[PDB]
C-alpha cells in the first residue's frame, strides 16, 4: 500500500521558519518524483516544489524560490520542505505527492496534508460547552444534542462522538472565524429520544496546537 | 506559465444525469492533463491522467477527452458520492498548474428543516458570554433565512452561520446560527427566538425559549 | 467587476441542470456560450434565452 504522510505544520510568525516532513511507505522515493503542492483560499491549488531523489534535481515555484528548499533522505524514504521568511500568503494546507509512480504521469498519491498558519496571533485552547438535549431540541421521536467548541486558535480542532463509535446522524459544522480572531464550531448529533438517559453521549474534542483534549459528557438539563 | 481555465465554476445535477465539466489550457499542453476529485474533508484524488486514461480503481462512469487545448471530464451517471470539487492540472511545462475547480452538487427533492434551539449552557454562563444556537437539520435546497429576535427585537450583526456540505446519505444540508451576547445582556432579556424561512415550509417557523424555563 | 451568470440547462428529455459562470460580465458570457456549444455536440442544437440583462440564461438543447 502506497502512503505519504506529512508532518510538521503549525502556527508560525511572519518572518519565521518551519520544516515539513513527508514520510513515504509502500514504495521507494528513488523511483519517483516527489512534489510539494499547497492549497489555500487565496490561490487554490498551487505547486510549490519538486525533487527527483535519485539525482537530486530540484525545481521551485517562483513565489517561494530562495525562501523554501526541498530535499530528500532516501535512507529514511522521506522528503522535506524547509520554509523560511514566511508570509501570510504562505498560509495553506501543504501536501506531498508522488509523480511517475508505476509509470503513471500524474500525481497519483497525495498525503492527508498539513496546515501551516502564518500569523502573529497566539495559540488559544477552546472552551467546550454542552448543547444539552431538551424539549426544544426534539421532534418525531428523535433528539438533537451537541458540543460548542468556542474560541480557539489556530486551526484545526477535531471532534468525534463516543470515541468514534457514533457517526450516524452527526453534523460537525465548518469552523467560523469570529470578530475576535478566534475560531468556533459546533458539532451536533441526532439520536432516538428514548436513548437519552440510558445511552452515554460524549464529544471528544482535540486541539493539538494548545494540547487541549476534552471529553465532554452531554446530558439533559436538571430543572 | 500556462494557465488552466475551468468552467463552469458550479454545476448542479440529479442522480443518474450525465455531467460535463471543461478545462482550457492557455497554450498547447499536448495530452499532459490530469483530473482530480476532492471530497469533503479529503485530499485531491486522481481520476484521469494524460487527458483520457482512467486511473486504477476509478469508476468507469468517469471519462476524459481532449480537443486541441480544450479538455473535458464527463461523469456519465452522476452518483451521490460524486458530490465533490473537480480540478484539472497540466504538467506539460514547469510550473505545473491547476484550474480553479468546479463544484458539483446533487439536485434532489425539497425537504423542510427540523428546527431546534439551544440556550447558553449553565457552564458557559459562569464566565460572562452567552451563545444561543439555532439548528436547522437535514434540508434542501441550501437557501434559508434565519433571523434572531430577543424580546421581539430583530437582531443584527451579532450572529454567525455555518452550513455543512451535502450529506453523503441523503444529499441534504444542515445549518447552525449562533447568537452571541454578553451574559449581562442575556440575563437582561427573556424571550429568545429563531425564525426560519425555507422553501419546504408553508410559512416561517419560529423556535423560541424563555430564559430560565425548563 | 465580478458577476455570476446563472444558467438553466434544459435537455430534450426534460432533465434540467443548473450551472454558474463567474468573471467579468464579458468573460462569463463568453464561457457560457462556449459551454453551450460544447454540450450541443452531444445534446443537439442549443437555444439561449437571456434574462436579467444577460445575467441569467435558459439554454435548451434540441436532442
Amino acid at each position: 500500500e502506497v502512503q505519504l504522510v506529512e508532518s510538521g505544520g503549525g502556527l508560525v510568525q511572519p518572518g519565521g521558519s518551519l520544516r515539513l516532513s513527508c514520510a513515504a511507505s509502500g514504495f521507494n522515493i528513488k523511483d519517483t518524483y516527489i512534489h510539494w503542492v499547497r492549497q489555500s483560499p487565496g490561490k487554490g491549488l498551487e505547486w510549490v516544489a519538486r525533487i527527483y531523489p535519485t539525482n537530486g534535481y530540484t525545481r521551485y515555484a517562483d513565489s517561494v524560490k530562495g525562501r523554501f528548499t526541498i530535499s530528500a533522505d532516501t535512507s529514511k524514504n522521506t522528503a522535506y520542505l524547509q520554509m523560511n521568511s514566511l508570509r501570510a500568503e504562505d498560509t495553506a494546507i501543504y501536501y506531498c505527492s508522488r509523480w511517475g509512480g508505476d509509470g503513471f504521469y500524474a500525481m497519483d498519491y497525495w498525503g492527508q496534508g498539513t496546515l501551516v498558519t502564518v500569523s502573529s496571533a497566539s495559540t488559544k485552547g477552546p472552551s467546550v460547552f454542552p448543547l444539552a438535549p431538551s424539549s426544544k431540541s426534539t421532534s418525531g421521536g428523535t433528539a438533537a444534542l451537541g458540543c460548542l467548541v468556542k474560541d480557539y486558535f489556530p486551526e484545526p480542532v477535531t471532534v468525534s462522538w463516543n470515541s468514534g463509535a457514533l457517526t450516524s446522524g452527526v453534523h460537525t459544522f465548518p469552523a467560523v472565524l469570529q470578530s475576535s480572531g478566534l475560531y468556533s464550531l459546533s458539532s451536533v448529533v441526532t439520536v432516538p429520544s428514548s436513548s437519552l438517559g440510558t445511552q452515554t453521549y460524549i464529544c471528544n474534542v482535540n486541539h493539538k496546537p494548545s494540547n487541549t483534549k476534552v471529553d465532554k459528557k452531554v446530558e439533559p438539563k436538571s430543572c | 506559465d500556462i494557465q488552466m481555465t475551468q468552467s463552469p465554476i458550479l454545476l448542479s445535477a440529479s442522480v443518474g444525469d450525465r455531467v460535463t465539466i471543461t478545462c482550457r489550457a492557455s497554450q498547447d499542453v499536448n495530452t499532459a492533463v490530469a483530473w482530480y476529485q476532492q471530497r469533503t474533508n479529503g485530499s485531491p484524488r486522481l481520476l484521469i491522467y494524460s487527458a483520457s486514461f482512467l486511473y486504477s480503481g476509478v469508476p468507469s462512469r468517469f471519462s476524459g477527452s481532449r480537443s486541441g487545448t480544450d479538455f473535458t471530464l464527463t461523469i456519465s451517471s452522476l452518483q451521490p458520492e460524486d458530490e465533490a470539487d473537480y480540478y484539472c492540472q497540466q504538467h506539460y511545462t514547469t510550473p505545473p498548474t491547476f484550474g480553479a475547480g468546479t463544484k458539483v452538487e446533487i439536485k434532489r427533492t425539497v425537504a423542510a428543516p427540523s428546527v431546534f434551539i439551544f440556550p447558553p449552557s449553565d457552564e458557559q454562563l459562569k464566565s460572562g458570554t452567552a451563545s444561543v444556537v439555532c439548528l436547522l437539520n437535514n434540508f434542501y435546497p441550501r437557501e434559508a433565512k434565519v433571523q434572531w429576535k430577543v424580546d421581539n427585537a430583530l437582531q443584527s450583526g451579532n450572529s454567525q452561520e455555518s452550513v455543512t456540505e451535502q450529506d453523503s446519505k441523503d444529499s441534504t444540508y444542515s445549518l447552525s446560527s449562533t447568537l452571541t451576547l454578553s451574559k449581562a445582556d442575556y440575563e437582561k432579556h427573556k424571550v429568545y427566538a429563531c425564525e426560519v424561512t425555507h422553501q419546504g415550509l408553508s410559512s416561517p417557523v419560529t423556535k423560541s425559549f424563555n430564559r430560565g424555563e425548563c | 467587476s465580478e458577476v455570476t451568470i446563472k444558467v438553466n440547462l434544459i435537455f430534450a428529455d426534460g432533465k434540467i441542470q443548473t450551472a454558474e459562470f463567474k468573471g467579468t460580465f464579458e468573460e462569463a458570457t463568453a464561457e457560457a456560450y462556449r459551454y453551450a456549444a460544447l454540450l450541443a455536440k452531444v445534446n443537439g442544437e442549443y437555444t439561449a434565452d437571456l434574462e436579467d440583462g444577460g445575467n441569467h440564461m435558459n439554454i435548451k438543447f434540441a436532442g
Binding site: 492549497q39 483560499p41 494546507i93 465548518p174 469552523a175 464550531l185 | 469533503t40 463544484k103 | -
Partner: peptide, 13 residues
C-alpha cells in the same frame, strides 16, 4: 468559489 480549510471544499457565493 473560494476554498475553505475547514471542509476542504470550494464555497460558492
Amino acid at each position: 468559489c473560494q476554498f475553505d480549510f475547514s471542509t476542504x471544499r470550494l464555497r460558492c457565493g
